[PDB]
């Protein structure tokens, strides 16, 4: 469409093109807000997004930390203060998940003080 070239040409895929790397906006002791710009369709439309997180000091796994996200800006919650986190965004469609976004790179939560200062 409004482009017609890329480095590669086609794929063996029926999935959306992935989101951009998220940003980070609001953070607290245990919520943080992520903002990204969306993927684009091809074969099919998009259904929703996921966000995963990973933290060595939480569980050794990547886990789902929001599911069927219908927005581009999302407050994560329930985290641990003074703990590092990673995030990736994933698109969803009628056939699979897309390729992931880039990682957010490791945020740190604040602390469970009030931050009067």
Q: Where are the domains of the chain?
A: 1-117
At 106, which helix (H) or strand (E)? Answer: none
Query: What is d(CA 26, CA 6) in angstroms, rounded to the nearest whole number?
Result: 35
User: How was it solved?
Assistant: NMR
Query: Residue 60 class from Cβ within 10 Å (0-12 exposed, 13-18 middle, 19+ buried)?
Result: exposed
Query: What is d(CA 95, CA 87) in angstroms, rounded to the nearest whole number?
Result: 23
From the list 64, 72, 76, the residue with the least C-alpha distance to 32 is: 76
CB 88 within 8 A of CB 104: yes
Query: What is d(CA 34, CA 24) in angstroms, rounded to the nearest whole number?
Result: 5
Query: What is d(CA 75, CA 88) in angstroms, rounded to the nearest whole number?
Result: 14
Q: What angle do CA 60, 62, 66 make, to 5 degrees?
A: 135
Q: Which CATH class is domain 1-117?
A: mainly beta
């Amino acid at each position: 469409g409004s482009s017609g070239s890329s480095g590669k040409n086609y794929d063996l895929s029926d999935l959306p093109g992935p989101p951009s790397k998220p940003q980070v906006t609001d953070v607290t002791k245990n919520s943080v807000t992520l903002s990204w710009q969306p993927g684009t369709p091809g074969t099919l439309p998009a259904s929703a997004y996921i966000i995963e997180a990973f933290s060595q000091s939480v569980s050794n796994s990547w886990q789902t930390v929001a599911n069927h996200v219908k927005t581009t800006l999302y407050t994560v919650r329930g985290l641990r203060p003074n703990t590092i986190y990673l995030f990736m965004v994933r698109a969803i469609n009628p056939q699979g998940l897309s390729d992931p976004s880039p990682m957010s790179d490791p945020v740190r939560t604040q602390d469970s003080g009030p931050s009067s200062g």
